[PDB]
Amino acid sequence: TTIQVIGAGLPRTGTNSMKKALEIIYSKPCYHMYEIIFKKQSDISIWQQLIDETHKTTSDKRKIYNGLNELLNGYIATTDLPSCSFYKELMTMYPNAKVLLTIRDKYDWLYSLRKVVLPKSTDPWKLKIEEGDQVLGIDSNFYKMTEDSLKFAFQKNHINLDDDEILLECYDEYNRLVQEIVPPERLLIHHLGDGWESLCQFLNVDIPNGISYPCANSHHQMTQLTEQLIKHKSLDDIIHMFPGLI
Ligand SMILES: Nc1ncnc2c1ncn2[C@@H]1O[C@H](COP(=O)(O)O)[C@@H](OP(=O)(O)O)[C@H]1O
Numbered sequence: 001t002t003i004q005v006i007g008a009g010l011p012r013t014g015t016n017s018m019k020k021a022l023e024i025i026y027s028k029p030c031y032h033m034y035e036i037i038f039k040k041q042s043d044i045s046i047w048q049q050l051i052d053e054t055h056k057t058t059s060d061k062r063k064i065y066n067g068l069n070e071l072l073n074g075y076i077a078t079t080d081l082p083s084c085s086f087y088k089e090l091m092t093m094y095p096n097a098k099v100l101l102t103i104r105d106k107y108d109w110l111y112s113l114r115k116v117v118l119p120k121s122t123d124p125w126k127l128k129i130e131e132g133d134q135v136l137g138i139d140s141n142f143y144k145m146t147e148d149s150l151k152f153a154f155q156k157n158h159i160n161l162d163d164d165e166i167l168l169e170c171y172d173e174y175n176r177l178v179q180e181i182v183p184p185e186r187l188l189i190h191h192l193g194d195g196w197e198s199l200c201q202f203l204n205v206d207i208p209n210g211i212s213y214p215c216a217n218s219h220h221q222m223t224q225l226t227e228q229l230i231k232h233k234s235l236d237d238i239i240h241m242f243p244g245l246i
């Protein structure tokens, strides 16, 4: 059991739905940020060490490959931040794995990103996210790892993450680059809304009979989850309000 599909799509492009879709297709687990937050928060420091390794004048690529392989043990696929930023290293490690690029309108993406993953530093919603994350046992190291992995995906050392215009152009550049460096036969570009057909064709499987394509992880749902975590101060107490999400 090793990686068959590498999800290179950025966060907030339908990765949790793609995660669920792949788990339906393969009946084996797919990695996602939800795996880290809700199941394995100890992975945060490991991802941080790997991203830190990339910032060295001479990076130890074998250390990174071995670290990626350990993180992804028991998974059939990976999606989302932070793994998407390592899609090149994953491609090298798993030469037979196919690559998915989940994609969507860039303006909707940015809006989604600011609501969940990367608020502007002066946005009051950032404090509500933090307070909510406190309930989940998430600390400040989490934000450093996600920030560093976005910067790593965009291949930038210095960047003003509060500038929407920069993030929009980074998004387009990122998706262009994936399309440039992944051979066409090894890549499926999956637009938000595309559903089973193109995906199943690509992965050489039939469309799941009587099972609809997943639709999960809206910023509306994430805003409500943040609100409810703050109100009740317990995930277990509110999880029934979020069926089928985690
Ligand atoms: N089947 C589907 N059709 C349309 N949008 C979908 C979808 N599945 C997920 N999404 C959207 O993809 C985004 C989440 O992606 P990710 O899981 O990578 O964080 C959300 O966007 P919004 O925040 O605009 O609602 C979510 O609503």
Ligand SMILES: CC(C)NC[C@@H]1CCc2cc(CO)c([N+](=O)[O-])cc2N1
Residues within 6 Å of the ligand: 011, 012, 033, 034, 037, 080, 081, 116, 117, 118, 129, 132, 133, 136, 146, 222, 223, 225, 226, 229
């Ligand atoms: C709602 C509040 C309690 N925070 C929890 C949410 C869960 C989904 C999520 C997903 C990503 C990337 O998919 C990131 N990210 O990269 O920062 C952060 C979060 N945070």
